[PDB]
Tab-separated table of C-alpha atoms and ligand atoms in Angstrom:
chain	number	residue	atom	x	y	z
A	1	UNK	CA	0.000	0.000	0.000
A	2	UNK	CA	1.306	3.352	-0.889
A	3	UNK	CA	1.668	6.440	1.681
A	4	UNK	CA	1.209	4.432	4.736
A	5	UNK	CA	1.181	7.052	7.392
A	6	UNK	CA	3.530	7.462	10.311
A	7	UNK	CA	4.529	9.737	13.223
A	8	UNK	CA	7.591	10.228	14.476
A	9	UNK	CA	8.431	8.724	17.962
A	10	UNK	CA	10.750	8.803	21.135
A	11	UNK	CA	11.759	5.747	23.687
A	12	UNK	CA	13.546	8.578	25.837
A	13	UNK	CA	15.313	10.561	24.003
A	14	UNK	CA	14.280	13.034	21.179
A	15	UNK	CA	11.362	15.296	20.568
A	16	UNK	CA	8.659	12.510	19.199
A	17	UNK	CA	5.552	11.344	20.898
A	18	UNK	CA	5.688	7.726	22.833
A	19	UNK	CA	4.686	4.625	20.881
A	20	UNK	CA	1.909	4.013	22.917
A	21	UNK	CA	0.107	7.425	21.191
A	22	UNK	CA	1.215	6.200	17.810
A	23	UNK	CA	-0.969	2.893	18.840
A	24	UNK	CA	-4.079	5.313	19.870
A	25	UNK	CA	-3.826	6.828	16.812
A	26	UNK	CA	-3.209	3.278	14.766
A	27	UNK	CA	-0.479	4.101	12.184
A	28	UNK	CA	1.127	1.248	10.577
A	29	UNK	CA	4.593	2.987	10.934
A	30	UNK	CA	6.849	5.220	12.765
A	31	UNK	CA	10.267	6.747	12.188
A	32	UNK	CA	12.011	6.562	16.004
A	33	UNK	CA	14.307	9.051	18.063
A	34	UNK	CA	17.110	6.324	18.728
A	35	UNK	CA	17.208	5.674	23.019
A	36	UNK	CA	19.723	7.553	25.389
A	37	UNK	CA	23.536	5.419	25.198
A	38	UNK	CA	22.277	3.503	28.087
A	39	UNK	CA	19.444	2.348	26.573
A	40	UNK	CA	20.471	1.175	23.570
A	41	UNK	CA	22.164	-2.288	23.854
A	42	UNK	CA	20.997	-5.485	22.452
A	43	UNK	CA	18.620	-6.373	25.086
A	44	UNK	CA	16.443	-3.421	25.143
A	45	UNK	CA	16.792	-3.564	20.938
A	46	UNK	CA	14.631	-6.621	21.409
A	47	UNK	CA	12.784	-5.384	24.175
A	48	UNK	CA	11.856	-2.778	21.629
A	49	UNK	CA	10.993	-4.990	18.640
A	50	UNK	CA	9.520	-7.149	20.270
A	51	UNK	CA	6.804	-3.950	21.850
A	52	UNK	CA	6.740	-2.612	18.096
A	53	UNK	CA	5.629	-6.027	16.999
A	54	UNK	CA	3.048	-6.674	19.149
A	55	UNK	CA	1.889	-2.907	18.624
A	56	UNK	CA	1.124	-3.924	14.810
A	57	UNK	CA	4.133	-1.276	13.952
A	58	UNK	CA	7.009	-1.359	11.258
A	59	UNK	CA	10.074	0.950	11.785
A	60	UNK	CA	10.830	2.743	9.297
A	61	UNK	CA	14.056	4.739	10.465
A	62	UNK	CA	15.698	5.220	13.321
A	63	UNK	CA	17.523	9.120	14.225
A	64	UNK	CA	20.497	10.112	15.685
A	65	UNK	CA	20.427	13.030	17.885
A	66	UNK	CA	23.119	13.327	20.529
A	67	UNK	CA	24.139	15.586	23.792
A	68	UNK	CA	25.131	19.142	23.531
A	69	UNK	CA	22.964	19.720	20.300
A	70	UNK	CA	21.043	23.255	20.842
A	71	UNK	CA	18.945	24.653	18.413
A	72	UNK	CA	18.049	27.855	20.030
A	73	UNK	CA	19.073	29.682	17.174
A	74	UNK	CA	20.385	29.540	13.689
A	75	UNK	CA	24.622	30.309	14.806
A	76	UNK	CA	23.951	28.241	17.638
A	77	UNK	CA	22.726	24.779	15.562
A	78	UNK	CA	25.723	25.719	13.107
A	79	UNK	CA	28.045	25.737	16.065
A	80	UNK	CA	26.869	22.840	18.384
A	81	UNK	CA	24.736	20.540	15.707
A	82	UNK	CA	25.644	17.122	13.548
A	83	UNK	CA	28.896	15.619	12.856
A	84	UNK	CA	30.155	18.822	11.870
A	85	UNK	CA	31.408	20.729	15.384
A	86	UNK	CA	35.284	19.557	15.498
A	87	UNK	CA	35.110	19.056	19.479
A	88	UNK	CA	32.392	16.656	19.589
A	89	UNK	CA	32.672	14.935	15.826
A	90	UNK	CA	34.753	11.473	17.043
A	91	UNK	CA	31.916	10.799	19.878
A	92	UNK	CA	28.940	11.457	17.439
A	93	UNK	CA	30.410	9.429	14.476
A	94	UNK	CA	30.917	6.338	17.273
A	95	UNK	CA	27.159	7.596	18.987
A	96	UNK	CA	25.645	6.998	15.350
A	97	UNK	CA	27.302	3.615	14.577
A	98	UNK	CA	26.102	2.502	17.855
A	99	UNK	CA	22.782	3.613	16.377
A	100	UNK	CA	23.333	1.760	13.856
A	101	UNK	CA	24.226	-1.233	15.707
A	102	UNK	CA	21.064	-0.759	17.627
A	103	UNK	CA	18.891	-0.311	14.347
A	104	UNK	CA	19.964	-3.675	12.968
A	105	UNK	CA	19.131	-5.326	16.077
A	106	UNK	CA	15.797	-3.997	15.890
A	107	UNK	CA	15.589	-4.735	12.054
A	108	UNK	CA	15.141	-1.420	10.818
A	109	UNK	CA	16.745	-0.674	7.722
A	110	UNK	CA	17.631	2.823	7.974
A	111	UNK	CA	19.035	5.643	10.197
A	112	UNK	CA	18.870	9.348	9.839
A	113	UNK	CA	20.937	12.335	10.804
A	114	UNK	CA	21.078	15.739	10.579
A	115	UNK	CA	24.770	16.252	9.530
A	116	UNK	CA	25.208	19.767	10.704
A	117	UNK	CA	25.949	22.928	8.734
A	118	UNK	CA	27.732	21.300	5.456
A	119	UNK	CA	31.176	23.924	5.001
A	120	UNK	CA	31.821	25.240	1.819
A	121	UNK	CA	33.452	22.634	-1.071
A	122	UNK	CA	36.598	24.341	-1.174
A	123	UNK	CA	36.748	24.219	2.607
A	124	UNK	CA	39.432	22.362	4.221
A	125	UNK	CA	37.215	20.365	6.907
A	126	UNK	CA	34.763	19.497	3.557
A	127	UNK	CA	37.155	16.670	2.835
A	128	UNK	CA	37.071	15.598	6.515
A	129	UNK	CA	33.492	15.223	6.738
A	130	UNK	CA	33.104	13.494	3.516
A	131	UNK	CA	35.910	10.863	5.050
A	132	UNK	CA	33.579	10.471	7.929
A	133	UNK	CA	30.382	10.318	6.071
A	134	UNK	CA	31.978	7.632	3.971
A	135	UNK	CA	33.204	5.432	6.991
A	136	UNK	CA	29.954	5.874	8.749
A	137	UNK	CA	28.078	4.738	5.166
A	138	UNK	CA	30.785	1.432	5.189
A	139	UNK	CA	29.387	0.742	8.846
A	140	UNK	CA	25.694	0.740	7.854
A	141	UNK	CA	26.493	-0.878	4.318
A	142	UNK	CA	27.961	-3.948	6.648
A	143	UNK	CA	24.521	-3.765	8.434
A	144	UNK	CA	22.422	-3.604	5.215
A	145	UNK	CA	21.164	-0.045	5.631
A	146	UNK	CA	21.270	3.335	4.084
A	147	UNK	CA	21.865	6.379	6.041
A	148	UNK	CA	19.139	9.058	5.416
A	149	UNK	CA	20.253	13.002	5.617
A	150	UNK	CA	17.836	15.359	7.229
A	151	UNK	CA	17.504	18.252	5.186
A	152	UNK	CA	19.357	21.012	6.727
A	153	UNK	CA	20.700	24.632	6.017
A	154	UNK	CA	22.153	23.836	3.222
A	155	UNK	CA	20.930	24.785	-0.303
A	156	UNK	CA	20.070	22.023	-2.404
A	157	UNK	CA	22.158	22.492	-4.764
A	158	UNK	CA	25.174	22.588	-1.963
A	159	UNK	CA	23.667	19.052	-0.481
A	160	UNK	CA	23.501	17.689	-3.876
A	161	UNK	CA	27.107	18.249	-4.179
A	162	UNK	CA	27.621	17.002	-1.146
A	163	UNK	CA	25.814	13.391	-1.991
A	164	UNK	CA	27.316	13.159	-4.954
A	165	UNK	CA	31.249	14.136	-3.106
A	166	UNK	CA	30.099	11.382	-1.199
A	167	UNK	CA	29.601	8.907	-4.190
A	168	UNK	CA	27.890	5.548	-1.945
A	169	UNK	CA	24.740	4.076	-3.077
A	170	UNK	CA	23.144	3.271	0.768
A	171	UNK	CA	23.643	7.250	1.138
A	172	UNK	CA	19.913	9.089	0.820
A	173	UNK	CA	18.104	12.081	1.940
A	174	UNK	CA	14.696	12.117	4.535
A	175	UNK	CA	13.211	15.041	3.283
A	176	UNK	CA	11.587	17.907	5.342
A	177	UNK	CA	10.036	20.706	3.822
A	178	UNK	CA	9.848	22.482	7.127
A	179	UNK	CA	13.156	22.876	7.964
A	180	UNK	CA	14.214	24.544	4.391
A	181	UNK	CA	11.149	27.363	5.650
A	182	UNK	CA	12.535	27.368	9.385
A	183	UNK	CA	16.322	28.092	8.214
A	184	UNK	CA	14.823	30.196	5.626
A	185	UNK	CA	16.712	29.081	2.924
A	186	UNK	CA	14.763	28.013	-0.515
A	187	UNK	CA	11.515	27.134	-1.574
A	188	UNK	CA	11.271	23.777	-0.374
A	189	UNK	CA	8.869	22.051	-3.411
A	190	UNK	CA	11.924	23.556	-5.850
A	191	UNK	CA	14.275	21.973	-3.695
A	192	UNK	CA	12.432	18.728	-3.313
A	193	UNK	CA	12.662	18.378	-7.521
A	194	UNK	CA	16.575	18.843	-7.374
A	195	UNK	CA	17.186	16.434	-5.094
A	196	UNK	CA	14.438	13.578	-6.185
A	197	UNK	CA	16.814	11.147	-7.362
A	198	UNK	CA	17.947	10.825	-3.364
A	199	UNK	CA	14.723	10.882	-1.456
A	200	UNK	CA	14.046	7.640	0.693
A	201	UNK	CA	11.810	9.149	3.449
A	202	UNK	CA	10.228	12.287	3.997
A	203	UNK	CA	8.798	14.087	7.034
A	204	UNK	CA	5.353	15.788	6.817
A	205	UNK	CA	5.831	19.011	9.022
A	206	UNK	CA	4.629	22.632	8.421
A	207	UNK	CA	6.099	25.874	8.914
A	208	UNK	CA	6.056	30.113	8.607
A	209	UNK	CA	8.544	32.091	7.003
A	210	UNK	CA	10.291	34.517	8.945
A	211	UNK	CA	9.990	38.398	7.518
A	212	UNK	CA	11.826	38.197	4.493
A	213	UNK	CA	14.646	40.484	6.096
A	214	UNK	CA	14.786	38.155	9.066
A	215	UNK	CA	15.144	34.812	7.042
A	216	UNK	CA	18.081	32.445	7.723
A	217	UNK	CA	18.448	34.783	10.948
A	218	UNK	CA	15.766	34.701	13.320
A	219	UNK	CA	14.146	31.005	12.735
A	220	UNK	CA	10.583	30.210	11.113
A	221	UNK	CA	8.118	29.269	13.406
A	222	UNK	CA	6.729	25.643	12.803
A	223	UNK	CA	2.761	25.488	12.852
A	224	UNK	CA	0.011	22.618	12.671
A	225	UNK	CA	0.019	20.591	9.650
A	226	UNK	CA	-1.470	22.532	6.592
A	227	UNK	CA	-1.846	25.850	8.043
A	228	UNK	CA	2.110	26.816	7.381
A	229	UNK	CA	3.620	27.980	4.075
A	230	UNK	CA	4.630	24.379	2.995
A	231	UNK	CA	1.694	23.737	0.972
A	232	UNK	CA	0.678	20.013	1.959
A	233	UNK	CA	-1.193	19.673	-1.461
A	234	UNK	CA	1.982	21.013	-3.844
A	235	UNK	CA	4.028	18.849	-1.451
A	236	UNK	CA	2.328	15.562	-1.751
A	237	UNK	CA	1.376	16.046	-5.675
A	238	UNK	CA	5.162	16.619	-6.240
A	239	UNK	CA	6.060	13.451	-4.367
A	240	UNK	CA	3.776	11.124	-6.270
A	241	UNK	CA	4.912	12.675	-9.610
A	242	UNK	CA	8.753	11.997	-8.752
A	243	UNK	CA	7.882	8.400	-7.752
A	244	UNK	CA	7.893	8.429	-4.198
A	245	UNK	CA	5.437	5.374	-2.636
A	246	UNK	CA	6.958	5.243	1.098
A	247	UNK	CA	5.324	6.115	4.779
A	248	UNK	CA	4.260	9.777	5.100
A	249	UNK	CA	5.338	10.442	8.288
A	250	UNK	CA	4.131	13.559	10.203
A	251	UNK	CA	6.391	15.356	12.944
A	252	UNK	CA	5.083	17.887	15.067
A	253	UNK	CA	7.717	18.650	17.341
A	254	UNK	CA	6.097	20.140	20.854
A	255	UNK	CA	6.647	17.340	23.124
A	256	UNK	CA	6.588	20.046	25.477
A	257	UNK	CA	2.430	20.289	24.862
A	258	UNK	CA	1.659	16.419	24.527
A	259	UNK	CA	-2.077	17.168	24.520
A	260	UNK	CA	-1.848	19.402	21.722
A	261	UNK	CA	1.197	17.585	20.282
A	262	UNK	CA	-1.188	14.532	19.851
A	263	UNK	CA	-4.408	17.372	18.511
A	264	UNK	CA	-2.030	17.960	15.476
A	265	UNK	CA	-1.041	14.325	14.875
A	266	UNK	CA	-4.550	13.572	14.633
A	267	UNK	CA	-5.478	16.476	12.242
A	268	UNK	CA	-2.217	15.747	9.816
A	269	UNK	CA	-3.501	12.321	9.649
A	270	UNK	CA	-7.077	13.139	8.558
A	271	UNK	CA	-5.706	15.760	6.347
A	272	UNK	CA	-2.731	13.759	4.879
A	273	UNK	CA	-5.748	10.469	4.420
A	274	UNK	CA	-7.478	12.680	2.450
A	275	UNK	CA	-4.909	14.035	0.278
A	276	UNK	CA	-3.521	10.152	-0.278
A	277	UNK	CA	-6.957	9.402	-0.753
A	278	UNK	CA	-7.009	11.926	-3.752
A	279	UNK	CA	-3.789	11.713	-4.822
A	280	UNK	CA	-2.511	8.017	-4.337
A	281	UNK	CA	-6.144	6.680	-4.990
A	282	UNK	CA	-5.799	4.931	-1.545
B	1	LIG	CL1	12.287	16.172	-10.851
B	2	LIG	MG1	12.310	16.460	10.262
């Protein structure tokens, strides 16, 4: 079945709703905020699988997201987000192949990151991150996964050249309109077209533009599924034309709210069901 809808979900760590609200609401899948390091061994990998099974729920990906990451504002995720920061690069590149150890157990084919704030080409630490994207791609190639990069700052045109510095065929992008609107960077529909060839997930998540002298300065603000700037329609339309079939997986990142956190889960599902309805025929 095409479009099968998701949400995106924390064990501990992370911003996404508990499984047990992903059960209430009855999606098929969910895309998972990997556990805290202690956590995350073998045992409670099974644990997990095992409460995903019985649950009626496939895992689609599973996130990285590590200590000292702020995104309080725009120079502050540059400085402190990803595998990019020198100080705390070797302990996020071993964090995420634990993650990826911890993913396999599980069974899910896939991790995600959000690299950080790609440098420039002709950059000197460009060629270091590439070497470290590469070894961390060899890790999850000997797992049978794909990594999946969280779009970020970058333009796509910069993250295209990026992937294809990169050159490895378990290397893909999750795609999130939302974040392109919050860092204020490019039309994210545009973008989505450039990079099409790469797109193995997506996020469904909605967002404002700042004032157009404010963008990639202050921060968009993020808003309830449809009523942002994304344009859920244009979004979805465009991802059926390019070929895209997989889960549709909403974020709404307000963990901080749960009641309302779950309100807009519940209306982005019954708006997302209608558009696949239209759209996907299903
Ligand atoms: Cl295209
Ligand atoms: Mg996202």
């Amino acid at each position: 079945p095409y479009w099968p809808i998701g949400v995106f979900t924390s064990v501990d760590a992370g911003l996404g709703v508990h499984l047990e609200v992903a059960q209430d609401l009855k999606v098929p899948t969910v895309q998972v905020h990997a556990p805290h390091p202690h956590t995350r061994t073998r045992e409670h990998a099974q644990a997990f699988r095992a409460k995903c099974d019985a649950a009626g729920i496939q895992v689609t990906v599973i996130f990285g997201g590590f200590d000292g990451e702020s995104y309080a504002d725009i120079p502050t995720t540059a400085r402190t987000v990803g595998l990019v920061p020198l100080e705390t690069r070797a302990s996020r590149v071993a964090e995420m192949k634990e993650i990826s150890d911890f993913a396999s157990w599980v069974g899910c084919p896939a991790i995600g990151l959000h690299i950080g704030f790609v440098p420039e080409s002709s950059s000197p630490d460009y060629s270091e991150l590439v070497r470290v994207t590469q070894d961390l791609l060899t890790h999850a190639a000997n797992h049978g996964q794909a990594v999946h990069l969280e779009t970020g700052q970058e333009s796509a045109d910069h993250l295209l050249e990026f992937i294809e510095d990169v050159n490895r065929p378990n290397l893909g992008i999750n795609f999130d309109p939302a974040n392109m609107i919050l860092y204020g960077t490019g039309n994210p529909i545009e973008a989505l077209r450039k990079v099409a060839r790469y797109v193995r997930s997506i996020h469904c998540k909605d967002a404002l533009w700042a004032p157009v002298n404010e963008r990639g300065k202050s921060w968009g603000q993020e808003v309830a599924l449809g009523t942002g700037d994304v344009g859920m329609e244009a979004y979805l339309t465009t991802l059926w034309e390019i070929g895209y079939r997989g889960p549709l997986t909403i974020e709404r990142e307000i963990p901080h709210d749960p009641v309302q956190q779950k309100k807009d889960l519940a209306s982005a599902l019954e708006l997302l069901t209608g558009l696949r309805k239209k759209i996907a025929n299903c």
